[PDB]
């Protein structure tokens, strides 16, 4: 406690890093809000997916 | 509006378990400091005390 607010600063930096990682994942994966479903019948011109 | 990760400042009482080996008998301190014949500085005696 004589040293000061080092631990709070490190915890804040790590929390910001984790929030930034979650933001990166959300901004790289949640591009579209409409969850489209694949059709049950697959006849895409002979292309096999 | 958010979620914060913080520390703790609480205090708790103490419960202790003490494990000490099976030992009963004294070891000689009242005769090494009370001996009449003491060794010299070149030929200092060395006694293992257990
Ligand atoms: C040496 O002997 C005296 C009495 O003879 C005793 O009071 C003293 O405690 C002894 N020394 C040690 C280190 O026990």
Swiss-Prot record, chain A:
Effect listed in the UniProt record for changing residue 43 to H: In strain: B.1.1.318
Impact noted for substituting residue 11 to K: In strain: Omicron/BA.1, Omicron/BA.2, Omicron/BA.2.12.1, Omicron/BA.2.75, Omicron/BA.4, Omicron/BA.5, Omicron/BQ.1.1, Omicron/XBB.1.5, Omicron/EG.5.1
Positions annotated as glycosylated: 48
Effect the entry attributes to changing residue 43 to Y: In strain: 19B/501Y, Omicron/BA.1, Omicron/BA.2, Omicron/BA.2.12.1, Omicron/BA.2.75, Omicron/BA.4, Omicron/BA.5, Omicron/BQ.1.1, Omicron/XBB.1.5, Omicron/EG.5.1
Function: Precursor of the fusion protein processed in the biosynthesis of the S protein and the formation of virus particle. Mediates fusion of the virion and cellular membranes by functioning as a class I viral fusion protein. Contains two viral fusion peptides that are unmasked after cleavage. The S2/S2' cleavage occurs during virus entry at the cell membrane by host TMPRSS2 or during endocytosis by host CSTL.
Descriptive protein name: Spike protein S2
Native source species: Severe acute respiratory syndrome coronavirus 2 (2019-nCoV)
Gene behind the chain: S
């Amino acid at each position: 406690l004589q040293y000061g607010s080092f631990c709070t600063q490190l915890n804040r930096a790590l929390t910001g890093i984790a929030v930034e990682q979650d933001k990166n994942t959300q901004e790289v994966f949640a591009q579209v809000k409409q969850i489209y479903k694949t059709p049950p019948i697959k006849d895409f011109g002979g292309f096999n997916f | 509006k958010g979620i914060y990760q913080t520390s703790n400042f609480r205090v708790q009482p103490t419960e202790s378990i003490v494990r000490f080996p099976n030992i009963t008998n004294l070891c000689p301190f009242g005769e090494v400091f009370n001996a009449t014949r003491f060794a010299s500085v070149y030929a200092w005696n060395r006694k293992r005390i257990s």
